[PDB]
């Protein structure tokens, strides 16, 4: 669709808005000292502005996309430049959720070089990528077979090759037991899965569980308690926790 660009603010152009609306404006947006009026199609207007047209709401969003720090790691889109010593994780923004930040931190604390890692609900593959970069051998699984080529592409940009399979926990078990399990899921599913997490992990294995709302944390606490796990540490950020357990 088309936009009309006028000099000024909304308060200041309030008098010509009836002309925008009657002309066919369906949305307005004040972009700092200008007003962009969203039309479906162009009309004759005597206000002296500039007609324009908007796949363009993409490398506009992509321009406002910043690297996300989770020391020791930095999460970068493929087009970002970044110097220093953070461990880079190049991810197509096709993330910097709090829960991603929490999981990366905890992988860095808990992971030991050579550990076999299961990333459950791997998505973009970011946590399995991080784990290989700290020196593990990671398997990411996900039930959406359409995310896996995207996960393996992201692996390619990071010069590591964790394996990516379609399935949930059950699909992954033939390839364990594992030394670490990382899982950015949610409380009710962690609770439902707690006994099979025990089976997935070797004695002394660790499960790093996130995606959990502060409020809802007690569900997982009891389930992991129920399942014979020892608490190791709780991390938090905004309304999100990660709960870490030892087998």
PDB file of C-alpha atoms in Angstrom:
ATOM      1  CA  UNK A   1       0.000   0.000   0.000  1.00  0.00           C
ATOM      2  CA  UNK A   2       0.828   3.746  -0.258  1.00  0.00           C
ATOM      3  CA  UNK A   3       1.879   6.452   2.250  1.00  0.00           C
ATOM      4  CA  UNK A   4       1.728  10.277   2.243  1.00  0.00           C
ATOM      5  CA  UNK A   5       4.499  12.139   4.046  1.00  0.00           C
ATOM      6  CA  UNK A   6       3.741  15.508   5.648  1.00  0.00           C
ATOM      7  CA  UNK A   7       5.944  17.964   7.540  1.00  0.00           C
ATOM      8  CA  UNK A   8       4.874  18.412  11.171  1.00  0.00           C
ATOM      9  CA  UNK A   9       3.220  16.613  14.092  1.00  0.00           C
ATOM     10  CA  UNK A  10      -0.325  15.183  14.628  1.00  0.00           C
ATOM     11  CA  UNK A  11      -1.400  17.979  16.989  1.00  0.00           C
ATOM     12  CA  UNK A  12      -0.171  20.515  14.358  1.00  0.00           C
ATOM     13  CA  UNK A  13      -1.807  18.770  11.345  1.00  0.00           C
ATOM     14  CA  UNK A  14      -5.073  17.995  13.144  1.00  0.00           C
ATOM     15  CA  UNK A  15      -6.784  20.612  10.818  1.00  0.00           C
ATOM     16  CA  UNK A  16      -5.920  18.707   7.587  1.00  0.00           C
ATOM     17  CA  UNK A  17      -6.733  15.214   9.012  1.00  0.00           C
ATOM     18  CA  UNK A  18     -10.387  15.406   7.862  1.00  0.00           C
ATOM     19  CA  UNK A  19      -8.939  15.733   4.345  1.00  0.00           C
ATOM     20  CA  UNK A  20      -6.691  12.696   4.879  1.00  0.00           C
ATOM     21  CA  UNK A  21      -9.595  10.573   6.199  1.00  0.00           C
ATOM     22  CA  UNK A  22     -12.050  11.601   3.472  1.00  0.00           C
ATOM     23  CA  UNK A  23      -9.310  11.084   0.898  1.00  0.00           C
ATOM     24  CA  UNK A  24      -8.989   7.520   2.226  1.00  0.00           C
ATOM     25  CA  UNK A  25      -6.470   7.352   5.123  1.00  0.00           C
ATOM     26  CA  UNK A  26      -6.712   4.168   7.210  1.00  0.00           C
ATOM     27  CA  UNK A  27      -3.788   4.820   9.556  1.00  0.00           C
ATOM     28  CA  UNK A  28      -1.540   7.614  10.836  1.00  0.00           C
ATOM     29  CA  UNK A  29       1.952   7.479  12.364  1.00  0.00           C
ATOM     30  CA  UNK A  30       4.124  10.351  13.650  1.00  0.00           C
ATOM     31  CA  UNK A  31       7.731   9.689  12.701  1.00  0.00           C
ATOM     32  CA  UNK A  32       9.481  12.528  14.552  1.00  0.00           C
ATOM     33  CA  UNK A  33       8.750  15.874  12.831  1.00  0.00           C
ATOM     34  CA  UNK A  34       6.749  14.194  10.090  1.00  0.00           C
ATOM     35  CA  UNK A  35       3.458  12.334   9.749  1.00  0.00           C
ATOM     36  CA  UNK A  36       3.128   9.256   7.542  1.00  0.00           C
ATOM     37  CA  UNK A  37      -0.481   8.647   6.486  1.00  0.00           C
ATOM     38  CA  UNK A  38      -1.327   5.061   5.422  1.00  0.00           C
ATOM     39  CA  UNK A  39      -3.648   5.000   2.398  1.00  0.00           C
ATOM     40  CA  UNK A  40      -4.665   1.992   0.294  1.00  0.00           C
ATOM     41  CA  UNK A  41      -4.182   3.974  -2.957  1.00  0.00           C
ATOM     42  CA  UNK A  42      -3.036   7.503  -4.003  1.00  0.00           C
ATOM     43  CA  UNK A  43      -5.369  10.543  -4.178  1.00  0.00           C
ATOM     44  CA  UNK A  44      -5.092  14.194  -5.231  1.00  0.00           C
ATOM     45  CA  UNK A  45      -3.993  16.195  -2.158  1.00  0.00           C
ATOM     46  CA  UNK A  46      -3.208  19.961  -1.869  1.00  0.00           C
ATOM     47  CA  UNK A  47      -1.072  19.793   1.302  1.00  0.00           C
ATOM     48  CA  UNK A  48       2.331  19.468  -0.412  1.00  0.00           C
ATOM     49  CA  UNK A  49       3.748  16.180   0.872  1.00  0.00           C
ATOM     50  CA  UNK A  50       5.338  13.171  -0.832  1.00  0.00           C
ATOM     51  CA  UNK A  51       3.689   9.961  -2.082  1.00  0.00           C
ATOM     52  CA  UNK A  52       5.606   6.724  -1.444  1.00  0.00           C
ATOM     53  CA  UNK A  53       4.990   2.945  -1.471  1.00  0.00           C
ATOM     54  CA  UNK A  54       5.779   0.086   0.961  1.00  0.00           C
ATOM     55  CA  UNK A  55       9.049  -6.759   1.948  1.00  0.00           C
ATOM     56  CA  UNK A  56       9.856  -3.126   2.804  1.00  0.00           C
ATOM     57  CA  UNK A  57       8.722  -3.484   6.431  1.00  0.00           C
ATOM     58  CA  UNK A  58      11.611  -5.971   6.567  1.00  0.00           C
ATOM     59  CA  UNK A  59      15.043  -4.365   6.047  1.00  0.00           C
ATOM     60  CA  UNK A  60      13.446  -1.524   8.004  1.00  0.00           C
ATOM     61  CA  UNK A  61      12.969  -3.756  11.072  1.00  0.00           C
ATOM     62  CA  UNK A  62      16.313  -5.421  10.328  1.00  0.00           C
ATOM     63  CA  UNK A  63      17.954  -1.935  10.516  1.00  0.00           C
ATOM     64  CA  UNK A  64      16.585  -1.435  14.042  1.00  0.00           C
ATOM     65  CA  UNK A  65      17.905  -4.869  15.128  1.00  0.00           C
ATOM     66  CA  UNK A  66      20.722  -4.824  17.679  1.00  0.00           C
ATOM     67  CA  UNK A  67      23.129  -7.537  18.903  1.00  0.00           C
ATOM     68  CA  UNK A  68      22.065  -9.111  22.170  1.00  0.00           C
ATOM     69  CA  UNK A  69      24.735  -9.601  24.843  1.00  0.00           C
ATOM     70  CA  UNK A  70      24.637 -12.695  27.114  1.00  0.00           C
ATOM     71  CA  UNK A  71      28.239 -12.809  28.434  1.00  0.00           C
ATOM     72  CA  UNK A  72      30.307 -14.854  27.410  1.00  0.00           C
ATOM     73  CA  UNK A  73      28.196 -14.844  24.167  1.00  0.00           C
ATOM     74  CA  UNK A  74      26.876 -12.148  21.781  1.00  0.00           C
ATOM     75  CA  UNK A  75      23.848 -12.938  19.544  1.00  0.00           C
ATOM     76  CA  UNK A  76      24.315 -11.448  16.094  1.00  0.00           C
ATOM     77  CA  UNK A  77      22.160 -11.302  12.980  1.00  0.00           C
ATOM     78  CA  UNK A  78      24.245 -12.308   9.889  1.00  0.00           C
ATOM     79  CA  UNK A  79      24.732  -8.671   8.865  1.00  0.00           C
ATOM     80  CA  UNK A  80      26.072  -7.382  12.189  1.00  0.00           C
ATOM     81  CA  UNK A  81      29.672  -6.455  12.767  1.00  0.00           C
ATOM     82  CA  UNK A  82      31.022  -6.856  16.214  1.00  0.00           C
ATOM     83  CA  UNK A  83      34.563  -6.911  17.499  1.00  0.00           C
ATOM     84  CA  UNK A  84      35.982  -8.270  20.681  1.00  0.00           C
ATOM     85  CA  UNK A  85      36.149 -11.472  22.635  1.00  0.00           C
ATOM     86  CA  UNK A  86      32.494 -12.490  23.262  1.00  0.00           C
ATOM     87  CA  UNK A  87      31.665 -15.918  21.771  1.00  0.00           C
ATOM     88  CA  UNK A  88      29.642 -15.022  18.688  1.00  0.00           C
ATOM     89  CA  UNK A  89      26.436 -16.797  17.794  1.00  0.00           C
ATOM     90  CA  UNK A  90      25.295 -15.843  14.286  1.00  0.00           C
ATOM     91  CA  UNK A  91      21.490 -16.399  14.097  1.00  0.00           C
ATOM     92  CA  UNK A  92      19.082 -15.470  11.285  1.00  0.00           C
ATOM     93  CA  UNK A  93      16.309 -13.381  12.857  1.00  0.00           C
ATOM     94  CA  UNK A  94      13.817 -15.151  10.499  1.00  0.00           C
ATOM     95  CA  UNK A  95      17.146 -14.532  19.743  1.00  0.00           C
ATOM     96  CA  UNK A  96      17.294 -12.030  22.638  1.00  0.00           C
ATOM     97  CA  UNK A  97      14.460 -13.337  24.670  1.00  0.00           C
ATOM     98  CA  UNK A  98      15.194 -13.194  28.418  1.00  0.00           C
ATOM     99  CA  UNK A  99      14.902 -17.006  28.455  1.00  0.00           C
ATOM    100  CA  UNK A 100      17.406 -17.403  25.683  1.00  0.00           C
ATOM    101  CA  UNK A 101      19.745 -15.022  27.630  1.00  0.00           C
ATOM    102  CA  UNK A 102      19.231 -17.122  30.831  1.00  0.00           C
ATOM    103  CA  UNK A 103      19.878 -20.443  29.005  1.00  0.00           C
ATOM    104  CA  UNK A 104      23.069 -19.223  27.344  1.00  0.00           C
ATOM    105  CA  UNK A 105      24.446 -17.950  30.685  1.00  0.00           C
ATOM    106  CA  UNK A 106      23.701 -21.270  32.380  1.00  0.00           C
ATOM    107  CA  UNK A 107      25.153 -23.379  29.583  1.00  0.00           C
ATOM    108  CA  UNK A 108      28.319 -21.350  30.070  1.00  0.00           C
ATOM    109  CA  UNK A 109      28.280 -22.018  33.878  1.00  0.00           C
ATOM    110  CA  UNK A 110      27.178 -25.663  33.697  1.00  0.00           C
ATOM    111  CA  UNK A 111      28.578 -27.113  30.497  1.00  0.00           C
ATOM    112  CA  UNK A 112      31.836 -29.090  30.553  1.00  0.00           C
ATOM    113  CA  UNK A 113      33.907 -29.678  27.354  1.00  0.00           C
ATOM    114  CA  UNK A 114      32.974 -33.051  25.860  1.00  0.00           C
ATOM    115  CA  UNK A 115      29.524 -33.172  27.458  1.00  0.00           C
ATOM    116  CA  UNK A 116      26.848 -34.619  25.214  1.00  0.00           C
ATOM    117  CA  UNK A 117      24.071 -31.967  25.049  1.00  0.00           C
ATOM    118  CA  UNK A 118      20.351 -32.305  24.256  1.00  0.00           C
ATOM    119  CA  UNK A 119      18.563 -29.082  23.344  1.00  0.00           C
ATOM    120  CA  UNK A 120      14.887 -29.808  23.496  1.00  0.00           C
ATOM    121  CA  UNK A 121      12.582 -27.543  21.424  1.00  0.00           C
ATOM    122  CA  UNK A 122      15.630 -26.227  19.610  1.00  0.00           C
ATOM    123  CA  UNK A 123      13.855 -23.816  17.205  1.00  0.00           C
ATOM    124  CA  UNK A 124      16.553 -21.706  15.445  1.00  0.00           C
ATOM    125  CA  UNK A 125      19.162 -24.052  17.085  1.00  0.00           C
ATOM    126  CA  UNK A 126      20.801 -21.267  19.093  1.00  0.00           C
ATOM    127  CA  UNK A 127      21.274 -23.167  22.354  1.00  0.00           C
ATOM    128  CA  UNK A 128      22.686 -26.242  20.564  1.00  0.00           C
ATOM    129  CA  UNK A 129      25.021 -23.928  18.663  1.00  0.00           C
ATOM    130  CA  UNK A 130      26.195 -22.203  21.899  1.00  0.00           C
ATOM    131  CA  UNK A 131      26.824 -25.610  23.499  1.00  0.00           C
ATOM    132  CA  UNK A 132      29.175 -26.747  20.661  1.00  0.00           C
ATOM    133  CA  UNK A 133      31.002 -23.437  20.958  1.00  0.00           C
ATOM    134  CA  UNK A 134      31.633 -23.993  24.704  1.00  0.00           C
ATOM    135  CA  UNK A 135      32.928 -27.472  23.681  1.00  0.00           C
ATOM    136  CA  UNK A 136      29.978 -29.876  23.889  1.00  0.00           C
ATOM    137  CA  UNK A 137      28.534 -32.189  21.274  1.00  0.00           C
ATOM    138  CA  UNK A 138      24.910 -31.120  20.883  1.00  0.00           C
ATOM    139  CA  UNK A 139      21.747 -32.658  19.468  1.00  0.00           C
ATOM    140  CA  UNK A 140      18.806 -30.287  18.884  1.00  0.00           C
ATOM    141  CA  UNK A 141      15.362 -31.733  18.277  1.00  0.00           C
ATOM    142  CA  UNK A 142      12.109 -29.980  17.415  1.00  0.00           C
ATOM    143  CA  UNK A 143       8.627 -31.160  16.317  1.00  0.00           C
ATOM    144  CA  UNK A 144       8.433 -28.599  13.485  1.00  0.00           C
ATOM    145  CA  UNK A 145      10.452 -30.273  10.657  1.00  0.00           C
ATOM    146  CA  UNK A 146      10.372 -26.893   8.901  1.00  0.00           C
ATOM    147  CA  UNK A 147      12.690 -25.247  11.530  1.00  0.00           C
ATOM    148  CA  UNK A 148      15.476 -27.824  11.131  1.00  0.00           C
ATOM    149  CA  UNK A 149      16.967 -26.588   7.785  1.00  0.00           C
ATOM    150  CA  UNK A 150      16.957 -23.133   9.377  1.00  0.00           C
ATOM    151  CA  UNK A 151      18.816 -24.579  12.410  1.00  0.00           C
ATOM    152  CA  UNK A 152      21.358 -26.286  10.270  1.00  0.00           C
ATOM    153  CA  UNK A 153      21.887 -23.096   8.225  1.00  0.00           C
ATOM    154  CA  UNK A 154      22.566 -21.148  11.436  1.00  0.00           C
ATOM    155  CA  UNK A 155      25.029 -23.881  12.472  1.00  0.00           C
ATOM    156  CA  UNK A 156      26.836 -23.333   9.131  1.00  0.00           C
ATOM    157  CA  UNK A 157      27.322 -19.627   9.899  1.00  0.00           C
ATOM    158  CA  UNK A 158      28.932 -20.497  13.213  1.00  0.00           C
ATOM    159  CA  UNK A 159      31.340 -23.134  11.867  1.00  0.00           C
ATOM    160  CA  UNK A 160      30.043 -25.901  14.153  1.00  0.00           C
ATOM    161  CA  UNK A 161      27.847 -28.860  13.395  1.00  0.00           C
ATOM    162  CA  UNK A 162      25.382 -29.933  16.070  1.00  0.00           C
ATOM    163  CA  UNK A 163      22.881 -32.449  14.759  1.00  0.00           C
ATOM    164  CA  UNK A 164      19.281 -31.568  14.219  1.00  0.00           C
ATOM    165  CA  UNK A 165      16.482 -34.151  14.269  1.00  0.00           C
ATOM    166  CA  UNK A 166      12.681 -33.924  14.077  1.00  0.00           C
ATOM    167  CA  UNK A 167      10.820 -35.152  17.190  1.00  0.00           C
ATOM    168  CA  UNK A 168      10.435 -34.467  20.939  1.00  0.00           C
ATOM    169  CA  UNK A 169      12.212 -36.100  23.899  1.00  0.00           C
ATOM    170  CA  UNK A 170      11.396 -39.592  22.728  1.00  0.00           C
ATOM    171  CA  UNK A 171      13.094 -39.146  19.325  1.00  0.00           C
ATOM    172  CA  UNK A 172      16.275 -38.013  21.156  1.00  0.00           C
ATOM    173  CA  UNK A 173      16.611 -40.834  23.699  1.00  0.00           C
ATOM    174  CA  UNK A 174      18.156 -43.417  21.255  1.00  0.00           C
ATOM    175  CA  UNK A 175      21.201 -41.062  21.095  1.00  0.00           C
ATOM    176  CA  UNK A 176      21.791 -40.603  24.804  1.00  0.00           C
ATOM    177  CA  UNK A 177      21.983 -40.712  27.724  1.00  0.00           C
ATOM    178  CA  UNK A 178      23.143 -37.076  27.824  1.00  0.00           C
ATOM    179  CA  UNK A 179      25.300 -35.078  30.244  1.00  0.00           C
ATOM    180  CA  UNK A 180      23.249 -31.945  29.832  1.00  0.00           C
ATOM    181  CA  UNK A 181      19.712 -31.128  28.825  1.00  0.00           C
ATOM    182  CA  UNK A 182      18.718 -27.589  28.001  1.00  0.00           C
ATOM    183  CA  UNK A 183      15.010 -26.849  27.355  1.00  0.00           C
ATOM    184  CA  UNK A 184      13.343 -23.406  26.878  1.00  0.00           C
ATOM    185  CA  UNK A 185       9.774 -24.731  27.059  1.00  0.00           C
ATOM    186  CA  UNK A 186       7.228 -23.856  29.750  1.00  0.00           C
ATOM    187  CA  UNK A 187       6.223 -24.934  33.248  1.00  0.00           C
ATOM    188  CA  UNK A 188       3.388 -27.283  32.495  1.00  0.00           C
ATOM    189  CA  UNK A 189       5.529 -29.233  29.935  1.00  0.00           C
ATOM    190  CA  UNK A 190       8.590 -29.407  32.147  1.00  0.00           C
ATOM    191  CA  UNK A 191       6.274 -30.731  34.881  1.00  0.00           C
ATOM    192  CA  UNK A 192       4.768 -33.273  32.423  1.00  0.00           C
ATOM    193  CA  UNK A 193       8.278 -34.258  31.225  1.00  0.00           C
ATOM    194  CA  UNK A 194      10.255 -34.374  34.569  1.00  0.00           C
ATOM    195  CA  UNK A 195      10.417 -38.287  34.847  1.00  0.00           C
ATOM    196  CA  UNK A 196      11.671 -38.695  31.254  1.00  0.00           C
ATOM    197  CA  UNK A 197      14.336 -35.939  31.912  1.00  0.00           C
ATOM    198  CA  UNK A 198      15.676 -38.262  34.615  1.00  0.00           C
ATOM    199  CA  UNK A 199      15.902 -41.141  32.109  1.00  0.00           C
ATOM    200  CA  UNK A 200      17.598 -38.858  29.482  1.00  0.00           C
ATOM    201  CA  UNK A 201      20.518 -37.897  31.746  1.00  0.00           C
ATOM    202  CA  UNK A 202      23.492 -39.808  33.169  1.00  0.00           C
ATOM    203  CA  UNK A 203      24.151 -39.739  36.934  1.00  0.00           C
ATOM    204  CA  UNK A 204      25.661 -36.315  37.614  1.00  0.00           C
ATOM    205  CA  UNK A 205      23.908 -34.900  34.502  1.00  0.00           C
ATOM    206  CA  UNK A 206      22.301 -31.428  34.656  1.00  0.00           C
ATOM    207  CA  UNK A 207      18.982 -30.203  33.292  1.00  0.00           C
ATOM    208  CA  UNK A 208      18.671 -26.505  32.565  1.00  0.00           C
ATOM    209  CA  UNK A 209      15.027 -25.589  32.391  1.00  0.00           C
ATOM    210  CA  UNK A 210      13.627 -22.238  31.213  1.00  0.00           C
ATOM    211  CA  UNK A 211      10.641 -20.610  29.529  1.00  0.00           C
ATOM    212  CA  UNK A 212       9.122 -20.590  33.020  1.00  0.00           C
ATOM    213  CA  UNK A 213       7.067 -17.623  34.396  1.00  0.00           C
ATOM    214  CA  UNK A 214       8.099 -16.633  37.962  1.00  0.00           C
ATOM    215  CA  UNK A 215       4.555 -17.305  39.163  1.00  0.00           C
ATOM    216  CA  UNK A 216       4.433 -20.760  37.578  1.00  0.00           C
ATOM    217  CA  UNK A 217       7.886 -21.918  38.808  1.00  0.00           C
ATOM    218  CA  UNK A 218       6.505 -23.948  41.790  1.00  0.00           C
ATOM    219  CA  UNK A 219       4.906 -26.503  39.360  1.00  0.00           C
ATOM    220  CA  UNK A 220       8.370 -27.391  37.983  1.00  0.00           C
ATOM    221  CA  UNK A 221      10.008 -27.211  41.377  1.00  0.00           C
ATOM    222  CA  UNK A 222       7.662 -29.926  42.689  1.00  0.00           C
ATOM    223  CA  UNK A 223       7.830 -32.062  39.507  1.00  0.00           C
ATOM    224  CA  UNK A 224      11.647 -32.089  39.458  1.00  0.00           C
ATOM    225  CA  UNK A 225      11.546 -32.712  43.227  1.00  0.00           C
ATOM    226  CA  UNK A 226       8.970 -35.451  42.489  1.00  0.00           C
ATOM    227  CA  UNK A 227      11.352 -36.872  39.875  1.00  0.00           C
ATOM    228  CA  UNK A 228      14.444 -37.110  42.141  1.00  0.00           C
ATOM    229  CA  UNK A 229      16.440 -34.049  40.991  1.00  0.00           C
ATOM    230  CA  UNK A 230      18.579 -31.748  43.256  1.00  0.00           C
ATOM    231  CA  UNK A 231      18.173 -27.954  42.830  1.00  0.00           C
ATOM    232  CA  UNK A 232      21.429 -26.268  41.695  1.00  0.00           C
ATOM    233  CA  UNK A 233      20.483 -22.619  41.125  1.00  0.00           C
ATOM    234  CA  UNK A 234      17.669 -20.375  40.059  1.00  0.00           C
ATOM    235  CA  UNK A 235      18.309 -17.491  37.692  1.00  0.00           C
ATOM    236  CA  UNK A 236      15.777 -14.809  36.831  1.00  0.00           C
ATOM    237  CA  UNK A 237      15.135 -11.961  34.397  1.00  0.00           C
ATOM    238  CA  UNK A 238      12.036  -9.795  34.185  1.00  0.00           C
ATOM    239  CA  UNK A 239       9.210 -12.288  34.874  1.00  0.00           C
ATOM    240  CA  UNK A 240      11.190 -15.349  33.677  1.00  0.00           C
ATOM    241  CA  UNK A 241      13.181 -17.897  35.552  1.00  0.00           C
ATOM    242  CA  UNK A 242      15.571 -20.629  34.590  1.00  0.00           C
ATOM    243  CA  UNK A 243      15.735 -23.520  37.116  1.00  0.00           C
ATOM    244  CA  UNK A 244      18.849 -25.762  37.071  1.00  0.00           C
ATOM    245  CA  UNK A 245      18.896 -29.315  38.451  1.00  0.00           C
ATOM    246  CA  UNK A 246      21.404 -32.068  38.946  1.00  0.00           C
ATOM    247  CA  UNK A 247      20.785 -35.722  38.321  1.00  0.00           C
TER     248      UNK A 247
END
